[PDB]
Design a binder for this molecule. Structure first.
Ligand SMILES: Nc1nc2c(ncn2[C@@H]2O[C@H](COP(=O)(O)CP(=O)(O)OP(=O)(O)O)[C@@H](O)[C@H]2O)c(=O)[nH]1
Ligand SMILES: [Mg+2]
Ligand SMILES: [Zn+2]
Ligand SMILES: [Zn+2]
Ligand SMILES: [Zn+2]
Lengths: 114, 69, 114, 1458, 172
RNA sequence: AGACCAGGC
DNA sequence: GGCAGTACTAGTAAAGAAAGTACTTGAC
DNA sequence: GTCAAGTACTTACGCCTGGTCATTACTAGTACTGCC
């Protein structure tokens, strides 16, 4: 018998939350796009000299996270931010795949990166 | 990296409440739900700032090129 | 000549190895993210010979990869099915284990010697 | 390009020829001689590859023209090759004439009267005399008295044939050359060369020539002439030969036979009368290209010389080696012995260098690319830099959506509004706005960045101040101070404004509506292109990071096309089906369900807010300059307006007044049962422009036929229907920001009763996988899952591919029945929140976003996860996964998942669903390289096909594909409401305003075409009881006798038959004659315009719906690979459909298919036991059959027929295979005295065959057959069981040739059908008693070509390309299928869309650009082929205007004075 | 993007007074369309919204490693009864108002917090201009590349798409 | 300008 | 003091898992 | 003349963005130094 049914998934595959509720290609897209985010690469950036480097300023730890998240030390590397998300047709600017931000959210530093 | 002044949804000043929260979790042995309520954070957009702050500046600050080690 | 292999990925061999491909052995570790950086060390690749190939049955998700290869963590597009990642508890042997007492205890279990 | 710098001459034609060496010593700038490129201090040494005589190089003036780097064009030089070396382009054609020629009399080895027979047939084919060249064979050991007289009769026949046709208005003295005379010319030269090469002796003087051996390239070898035939050289009274000797032979051959090769090497008549020479196959002088075109690879300090310099250096190094090798021949035995063996070594290496310069793959030696390989493939020169080019004045950025844009615009950023610029020449009317544009400068919008003076000079505004910049604004409109520039004016490069035009473009541009022309409206904030949602259906453009191109045209000829012709309002209907592609998409469709509901009531402040929020009269959306309203629906207690009445007065303000409202009766996607008992909201009802009933949906506005927006497009025009999408785009946006739409977790739950329903039908599925398994394995009744007979045969099923395919099809069929029982019950009936409140379900019924199968997988049941037809694949062990036991008959184990996306999928339901998800992404990604090369092959053949002014569509060179487009010459984007007669009758007075019948009587003929339309309608109703072959027709259709674009009433026959059928059934103040006189003008206005690039449209109407398939008969994109691309006569699965007569019954049919279906000798044998005894090799072949009560019932093979197959068919093949192997290795029963007739039967087989010494057959039961077989002792061991098996599978009992099986399927669509699995028409013509022989259709389009002709294969190719889009429910109209048919059968054969189906073509730059460039290049230059620059591929290479559409005519100017 | 494959560019930084607002006083700082859900079937994002909002209210984190829920204890019931004990709606909804007109919306709008991710695909790495610029020396056609101020390619499939409109001066 | 690698739609 | 050995230097020379037709060579 | 099979050349979705590395041996020569 297996110890747990989650030792069949990879590192990034265990960190998508409620993975058994998505369609199968959309879990495959998140493992691709989760390793393309603007997160924090390290903390030794004063001693690095890499030719291109992205760094999101204020990351957060997720409310909704797997137990493998705190076991691989992903709190050392925050890759995003908790956002108050309304699922609403209100705007007209967000139909196909688009989405809007509160303007005064990122006048305050929501999702800012260098 | 460091605690956000003025939370991202309404605009309540939040950045003065990080060092009180760690005081209200370690010295006063509280859970995180009571400590967010005692600091005056009622709206859940304000609550997810201090609940989910990483405070990663303390890991940055141990690389100080201006002092011997 | 070993700094040339790592910087380019080209395999220069006078008595060519047991490998089908001749280039593309080394890949830049990005550190564009920490999800990206840890994913470089868990990825498996089938070979660049199989990429430039118009078959489908080599890219399939086989049922023999239960707990060894990850089902979802696989890129979309051209490397789909070819580049894929291990399950997080799948570990690879790296040393020859002790064998020298196993024929000595198989003869006592009824194996007639060769 | 400057419009103020015209150019005088034009290239009208080109033609191909070979540089002789005398030209490229006169053409040359300087012969270059030393193999050092540049010396120390970087100077190009005089006489090297870099010389100042060959062009200015690196800040050093040219020595030929004296100009610098910017103005020297570059000059050609040459080298002097000392030996005449082979040109590798012509070596395959040199080697034919190198052979086939006599080395003694220097003619070819044919008789000289048959070589003359081709010279007089190819002279006729130079002119347009394809018919008379076959009459020339009618002019017909043997003395030379009459062969000299036969050559006079054939030559005087040609001189009489050419002179008559040149006077009978048929052929110019420049000669008529079409596509089908290029067919019979290439056919005749390939007959000529194949017959030259097959000769033993010269038939002029009868003795042999020593044969030649082509080792590869760079060398040539003459072989040893044998001792048997050197006697013929003595009764007439191996060695590497030099390239100088081959030229010596062939200069003599081309003079003794000059009079034939003038016509082999010329397609058109040789007016210059030049000789063809053998020096033209060799090359004695290389042409070095100018030093502009071989500049070094500069990258910082890493300066490398060009790859051509590295190849040309080796030719010069070898050329000075051989000069220093021939300096020892002037000094002069050992000094001669070794210096010649190294000189002949230098002959090979200078040839090996002139190979590598031209072609890198004909060079023995990672190699340096040659001149051939800079031209060939993708990344060549034709495909990378001629058919596609990088462009100036063009932008690309990510797109974000934008409403409040008027649907014919693109929203351009400020940062493209500043960089992109347009040359306005200054006039008296621009100096208001273009003086302020230059004052604003390069950074202020609206501004300008440069001024072009009259002189061609160009003044930049970038580094200037505003005081200097106001001085240039007053100097802007000044008269010229130069006489030679007095008629020119200054051009101000203004910024792009709100009035310009823009091409928008997203890759892949799979059809022409993926590259449209938008207006521009600048936006002041950010750096992204901004697109309205009606454009997203045509570009196929979501907003998950799409970037799409933006091209800005630079003159008024291209601004007028991208506003009128390639406009985005013209592209409402796609020409694939005629169905629309433009419409509102996701939020606007879910809003119109709520806005047009019966619940939606609006008070007076709300009602007047929604109308002004979408109309806004100052921007000119209204047509009245004052918003009119309606009285409210409910007056008391307080006024309220229903939301039907919102769109009533929306469609009242944007419509033209004094033109009546639209009348429209349609339906929508939501049933009446979703609303309530007795609702009528399914049918929609616009009456006098007022929405009186029904919900507006995706089917009304959106990419959907016969909605309201599609009906605004027909009644009011394309400019109105694009405006209604703007208004409904804003009305449904402002209704959403005041009354919003959301979906949540609340919308996904079933009831407590619905979940109780779901978990009880899913309890039936727990035994389905066993009941399905027991059917396939044929176990009896209710067998348990662990039955050892069940588990035995399931392992037998697993090891076979097809037995596992019918387990995975029966079991899948039963579990999709359980799936449909869940879905038909649990939704809509068992859902907790219901329509309209259930928002997940509301946007799937409405078609906003989603499907009914999507909410099935969320709320009820995810379903059977299916692989490529099959279920989840199984391991070797029988386990489908390690969680399940081996060979279990559970439906869950084979991929049927029972969880849902609401509640969750189990870890093995998850893993099986990961298999199907990856499979869909592999077929999306790596399998569109097969559909994308379908469309490339289609568009190259059909790029020049277009409508002519004859209304007769044809190819670019002039050859005719059809006589009329589709047989009726009407556009697909105009025939939508052509047969919608009850729509056009209700909207008669509004359609009469746009067709205007009485105003157009004057310029037309009304009287003539209507008479002959009544003389053929009345004639055909009297006839047409008999079939088509009996019809003495006596009358053409009226559409081929009269021009339908000029004569009113020249319609097609089914338009005439459907009009009078409508005008007879329902007889209904418009009378009967005014209605038929308006449909006949609507038909005439729906004619296709001359100049329509039809073959491009017909090739994009197949390649783009083929990408609706991606991204026992073959099906889909492999079926289109066989029909269109390969034209395979060796089709993968040929069939034939046999109509059963109605007299014979179904029992007389399935007993008839056994006589057609083949029976092998393999299909009758139980087992074969050999018995090899030795010590004389004796094989006792005992072959054991089934019972005679068993095989004479299955296959109906009799006992006596089985004996003759063994006697006369099996042993003749078995004995032939044993002798084959012996050659290639030299490197129970009673006694035999039953009757003498078995002894006589035995004695014949021993007598006839080779080494059978005994034979007997079971003549009383047919069960066994046993024959002895003897060999000697010299033969070693044969297997003789793998021999017998491979002969028993080949020996046939009862075979009809080319037919393997005959199947009687279920009767599809009424008629009775008997399908065979092969094609043989000749054998199915003897079965008159069972099969309707006048209805035998087929599948193999090359076999129906062979027996039924050209037109029947033309009909079969349309039906085979129709039913490949019928499996996927894709409707592509029959006119695209008509033209792909009539292009593939244009020569009377069945030609493919590949490089073998395009060799018969006139345009050489079309063939060079497609593939194998330097094989069509050599065939063009050895024909000396002149091409008139007709194809669009040939006009882009040389730079002409394209001959299609706008360039299909000239524009002339009426000057007033003499 | 979200953690469920819901990618998409930003359209407009919508002002706070124009955004919808709840009765609690907050405003959502991300709006996603409800039409991104039915064709994609990312129900894991609907349940991260419940689990996210029910965790920020009580100050707890919820494990979301897969197959901790059966079909009998749905997480819509687990995180629904946590939102009911806080005083919010069981189904994750909130009564919201419009920012433009200030009216009560029809249905209670579905909100909650999820964890977004900012991807590295900005516009500034995209977005190339060209009026004129450097050309290739061999062909005098514009250079390939954004960083070398080069031009975009009108390839073969774009060429005959200009034939198909019949426009012949756009092709030249 | 190439080759390889990593990606976007 | 000058001779010859090495260690360098800059100098110019060599670098194994797709499907279609057309063709010659090939026995008979 | 002939069918025959082996062999040889030929294509295999469009566009876009980054990044890296890139000739090696050797051979004769002028100069450095250890030496007597
Ligand atoms: N010509 C090509 N187009 C491609 C290729 N890969 C992707 N694409 C385009 O990118 C788009 C990819 O769509 P997706 O893979 O995201 C399928 P998805 O379920 O996300 O569609 P939606 O449901 O509309 O979001 C599709 O429109 C294609 O036109 C390719 O290799 N070649
Ligand atoms: Mg997209
Ligand atoms: Zn707040
Ligand atoms: Zn010059
Ligand atoms: Zn002769």
């Amino acid at each position: 018998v297996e110890f747990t049914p989650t030792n069949i998934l990879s590192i990034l595959a265990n960190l998508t939350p409620f993975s058994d509720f998505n369609q199968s290609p959309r879990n495959m897209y998140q493992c691709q796009m989760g390793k393309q985010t603007m997160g924090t690469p390290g903390v030794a950036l004063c001693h690095r000299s890499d030719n291109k480097l992205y760094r999101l300023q204020t990351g957060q730890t997720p409310i909704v996270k797997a137990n493998l998240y705190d076991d691989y030390g992903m709190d050392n590397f925050p890759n995003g931010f908790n956002a108050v998300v309304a699922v609403i047709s209100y705007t007209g600017y967000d139909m196909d795949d688009a989405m809007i931000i509160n303007k005064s959210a990122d006048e305050r530093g929501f999702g800012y990166g260098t | 990296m460091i605690v956000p002044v003025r939370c991202f949804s309404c605009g309540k000043v939040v950045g003065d409440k990080w060092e009180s929260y760690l005081n209200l979790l370690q010295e006063d042995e509280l859970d995180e739900g009571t400590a967010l309520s005692r600091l005056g954070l009622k709206r859940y957009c304000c609550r997810r700032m201090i609940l989910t702050h990483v405070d990663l500046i303390e890991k940055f600050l141990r690389y100080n090129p201006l002092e011997k080690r | 000549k070993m700094q040339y292999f790592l910087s380019t990925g080209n395999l220069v061999s006078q008595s060519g190895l047991d490998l089908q491909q001749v280039s593309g052995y080394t890949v830049v570790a990005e550190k564009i993210n920490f999800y990206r950086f840890i994913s470089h060390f868990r990825m498996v690749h089938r070979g660049s010979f199989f990429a430039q190939l118009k078959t489908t049955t080599v890219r399939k998700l086989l049922p023999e990869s239960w707990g060894f290869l990850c089902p979802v963590h696989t890129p979309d597009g051209s490397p789909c099915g070819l580049l894929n990642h291990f399950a997080h508890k799948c570990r690879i042997s790296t040393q020859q284990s002790d064998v020298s007492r196993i024929p000595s205890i198989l003869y006592s279990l009824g194996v007639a010697p060769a | 390009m400057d419009i103020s710098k015209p150019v005088g001459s034009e290239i009208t034609s080109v033609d191909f020829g070979i540089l002789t060496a005398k030209e490229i010593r006169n053409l040359s700038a300087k012969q270059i001689t030393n193999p050092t490129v540049l010396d120390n201090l970087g100077h190009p040494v005089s006489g090297g590859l870099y010389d100042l005589a060959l062009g200015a190089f690196l800040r050093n003036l040219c020595s030929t023209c004296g100009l610098d780097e910017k103005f020297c064009p570059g000059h050609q030089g040459h080298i002097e090759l000392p030996v005449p070396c082979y040109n590798p382009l012509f070596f395959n054609q040199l080697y034919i004439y190198l052979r086939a020629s006599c080395l003694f009399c220097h003619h070819f080895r044919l008789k000289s009267v048959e070589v003359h027979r081709y010279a007089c047939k190819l002279r006729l084919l130079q002119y347009g005399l394809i018919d008379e060249s076959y009459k020339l064979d009618e002019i017909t050991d043997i003395s030379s008295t009459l062969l000299n007289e036969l050559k006079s009769k054939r030559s005087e026949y040609v001189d009489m044939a050419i002179a008559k046709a040149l006077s009978d208005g048929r052929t110019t003295e420049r000669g008529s050359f079409t596509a089908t005379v290029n067919d019979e010319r290439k056919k005749l030269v390939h007959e000529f060369h194949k017959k030259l090469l097959s000769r033993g002796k010269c038939d002029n003087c009868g003795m042999f020539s020593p044969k030649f051996r082509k080792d590869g390239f760079t060398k040539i070898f003459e072989t040893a002439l044998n001792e048997k035939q050197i006697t013929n050289n003595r009764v007439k009274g191996s060695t590497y030969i030099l390239s100088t000797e081959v030229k010596n032979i062939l200069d003599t051959v081309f003079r003794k036979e000059q009079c034939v090769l003038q016509y082999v090497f010329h397609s058109r008549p040789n007016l210059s009368r030049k000789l063809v020479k053998a020096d033209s196959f060799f090359m004695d002088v290389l042409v070095v290209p100018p030093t502009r075109f071989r500049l070094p690879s500069k990258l910082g300090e890493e300066v490398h010389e060009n790859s051509q310099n590295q190849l040309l250096s080796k030719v010069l190094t070898t050329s000075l080696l051989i000069r220093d090798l021939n300096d020892d021949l002037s000094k002069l035995l050992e000094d001669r012995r070794v210096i010649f063996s190294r000189l002949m070594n230098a002959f090979v290496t200078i040839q090996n260098d002139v190979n590598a310069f031209i072609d890198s793959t004909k060079a023995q030696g990672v190699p340096i690319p040659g001149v051939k390989q800079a031209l060939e493939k993708k990344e060549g020169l034709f495909r990378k830099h001629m058919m596609g080019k990088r462009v100036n004045y063009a932008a690309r950025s990510v797109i974000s959506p934008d409403p409040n844009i008027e649907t014919n615009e693109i929203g351009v950023p400020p940062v493209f509004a500043v960089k992109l610029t347009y040359p306005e020449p200054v006039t008296a009317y621009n100096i208001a706005e273009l003086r302020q544009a230059v004052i604003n400068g390069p950074d202020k919008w609206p501004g300008a960045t440069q001024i072009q003076n009259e002189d061609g000079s160009l003044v930049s505004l970038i580094g200037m101040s505003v005081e200097q910049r106001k001085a240039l604004a007053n100097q802007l409109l000044t008269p010229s101070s130069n006489v030679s520039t007095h008629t020119l004016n200054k051009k101000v490069y203004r910024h792009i404004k709100n009035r310009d035009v823009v091409l928008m473009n997203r890759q892949p541009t799979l059809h022409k509506a993926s590259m449209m022309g938008h207006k521009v409206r600048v936006l002041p904030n950010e750096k992204t292109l901004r697109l309205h949602y009606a454009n997203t259906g045509a570009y196929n453009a979501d907003f998950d990071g799409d970037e799409m191109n933006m091209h800005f045209p630079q003159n008024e000829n291209a601004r007028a096309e991208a506003l009128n012709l390639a406009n985005t309002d013209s592209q409402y209907l796609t020409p694939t089906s005629g169905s629309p592609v433009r419409g509102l998409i996701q939020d606007h469709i879910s809003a119109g369900v709520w806005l047009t509901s019966k619940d939606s009531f609006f008070t007076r402040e709300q009602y007047q807010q929604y109308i002004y929020g979408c109309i806004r009269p100052e921007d000119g959306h209204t047509t009245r300059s004052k918003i009119v309203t309606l009285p409210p629906t409910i007056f008391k207690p307080y006024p309220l307006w229903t939301g039907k009445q919102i769109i009533t007065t929306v469609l009242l303000n944007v419509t033209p007044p004094d033109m009546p409202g639209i009348n429209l009766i349609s339906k929508n996607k939501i049933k009446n049962e979703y609303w309530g008992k007795g609702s009528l909201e399914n049918e929609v009802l616009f009456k006098d422009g007022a929405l009186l009933c029904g919900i507006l949906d995706k089917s009304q506005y959106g990419a959907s036929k016969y909605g309201i927006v599609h009906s605004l497009h027909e009644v009011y025009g394309p400019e109105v229907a694009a405006k209604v999408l703007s208004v409904l785009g804003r009305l449904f946006t402002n209704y959403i920001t005041a009354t919003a739409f959301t979906c949540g977790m609340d919308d996904l739950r079933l009831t407590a009763e619905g979940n109780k329903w779901r978990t009880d039908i899913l309890k039936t599925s727990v035994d389905t996988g066993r009941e399905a398994a027991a059917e396939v394995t044929n176990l009896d009744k209710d067998t348990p899952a662990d039955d050892p007979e069940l588990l035995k045969r399931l392992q037998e099923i697993l090891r076979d591919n097809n037995k596992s395919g019918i387990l995975d099809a029966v079991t899948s069929s039963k579990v999709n029945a359980i799936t449909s029982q869940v879905v038909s019950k649990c939704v809509p009936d068992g859902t907790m929140k219901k329509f309209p409140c259930n928002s997940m379900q509301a946007m799937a019924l409405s078609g906003a976003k989603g499907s009914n199968v999507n909410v099935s997988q969320i709320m009820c049941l995810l379903g059977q996860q299916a692989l490529e037809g099959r279920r989840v694949p199984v391991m070797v062990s029988g386990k489908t996964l390690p969680s399940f036991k081996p060979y279990e008959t559970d439906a869950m184990a084979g991929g049927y998942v029972k969880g849902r996306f609401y509640s969750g999928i189990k870890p093995q339901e998850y893993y099986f669903h990961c298999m199907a998800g990856r499979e869909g992404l592999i077929d999306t990604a790596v399998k569109t390289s097969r559909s994308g090369y379908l469309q490339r092959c289609l568009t190259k053949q059909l790029e020049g096909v277009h409508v002519s002014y004859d209304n007769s569509i044809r190819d670019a060179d002039g050859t005719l594909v059809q006589f009329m487009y589709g047989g009726d010459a009407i556009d697909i984007t105009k025939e939508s409401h052509m047969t919608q007669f009850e729509f056009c009758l209700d909207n008669y007075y509004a359609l009469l305003k746009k067709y205007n019948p009485s105003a157009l009587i004057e310029h037309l003929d009304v009287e003539s075409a209507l008479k002959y339309s009544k003389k053929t309608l009345k004639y055909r109703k009297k006839h047409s009881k008999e079939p088509h072959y009996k019809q003495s027709v006596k009358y053409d259709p009226v559409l081929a006798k009269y021009n339908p674009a000029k004569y009113l009433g020249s319609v097609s026959e089914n338009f005439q038959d459907k009009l009078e059928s409508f005008l007879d059934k329902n007889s209904k103040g418009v009378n009967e004659k005014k209605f038929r006189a308006l449909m006949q003008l609507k038909y005439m206005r729906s004619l296709i315009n001359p100049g329509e690039a039809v073959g491009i449209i017909a090739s994009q109407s197949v390649g783009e719906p083929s990408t609706q398939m991606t991204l026992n008969v073959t099906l889909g994109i492999p079926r289109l690979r066989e029909i269109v691309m390969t034209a395979s006569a060796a089709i993968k699965t040929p069939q034939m459909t046999l109509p059963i007569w109605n007299d014979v019954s179904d029992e007389q049919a399935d007993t008839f298919c056994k006589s057609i279906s083949k029976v092998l000798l393999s299909e009758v044998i139980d087992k074969v036991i050999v018995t090899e005894t030795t010590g004389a090799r004796s094989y006792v072949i005992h072959m054991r059959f089934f019972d005679n009560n068993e095989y004479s019932e299955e296959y109906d093979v009799s006992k006596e027929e089985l004996q003759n197959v063994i006697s006369n068919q099996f042993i003749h093949l078995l004995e032939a295979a044993i002798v084959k192997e012996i050659k290639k290795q030299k490197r129970v029963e009673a006694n035999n005295n039953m009757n003498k007739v078995q002894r006589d039967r035995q004695s014949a087989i021993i007598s006839h065959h080779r080494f059978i010494t005994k034979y007997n057959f079971d003549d009383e039961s047919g069960k066994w057959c046993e024959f002895k077989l003897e060999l000697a002792a010299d033969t070693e061991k044969l297997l003789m069981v793998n021999i017998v098996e491979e002969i028993c599978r080949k020996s046939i009992i009862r075979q009809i040739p080319h037919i393997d099986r005959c199947v009687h399927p279920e009767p599809e669509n009424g008629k009775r059908v008997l399908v065979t699995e092969g094609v043989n028409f000749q054998a199915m013509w003897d079965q008159e008693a069972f099969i309707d022989v006048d209805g035998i259709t087929s599948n193999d389009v090359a076999a129906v070509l062979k027996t039924y002709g050209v037109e029947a294969a033309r009909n079969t190719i349309v039906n085979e390309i129709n039913n490949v889009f019928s499996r996927y429910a894709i409707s592509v109209s029959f006119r695209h299928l008509d033209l792909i048919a009539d292009m593939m059968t244009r020569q009377g054969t069945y030609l493919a869309f590949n490089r073998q189906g395009m060799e018969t073509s006139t345009s050489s730059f079309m063939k060079m650009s497609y593939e194998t460039t330097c094989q069509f290049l050599t065939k063009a230059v050895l024909d000396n082929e002149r091409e008139q620059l007709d194809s669009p591929s040939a006009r882009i290479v040389v730079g002409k205007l394209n001959n299609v559409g706008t360039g299909s005519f000239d524009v002339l100017a009426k000057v007033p004075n003499a | 993007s979200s953690r469920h494959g819901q990618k998409g560019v930003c359209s407009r930084k919508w002002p706070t007074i124009d955004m919808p607002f709840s009765e609690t006083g907050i405003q959502p700082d991300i709006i996603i369309n409800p039409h991104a859900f039915p064709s994609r079937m990312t129900i894991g994002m609907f349940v991260e919204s419940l689990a996210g909002k029910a965790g920020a209210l009580h100050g707890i984190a919820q494990d979301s490693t897969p197959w901790i829920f059966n079909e009998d204890d749905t997480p819509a019931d687990y995180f629904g009864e946590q939102l009911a004990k806080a005083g919010y709606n069981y189904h994750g909804n909130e009564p919201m108002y419009s920012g433009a007109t200030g009216e009560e919306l029809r249905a209670d709008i579905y909100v909650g917090v999820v964890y977004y991710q900012r991807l590295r695909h900005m516009v500034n790495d995209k977005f190339q201009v060209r009026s004129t610029g450097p050309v290739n020396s061999l062909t005098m056609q514009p250079v390939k590349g954004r960083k070398r101020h080069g031009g975009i390619r009108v390839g073969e499939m774009e060429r005959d798409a200009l034939i198909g409109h019949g426009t012949s001066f756009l092709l030249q």
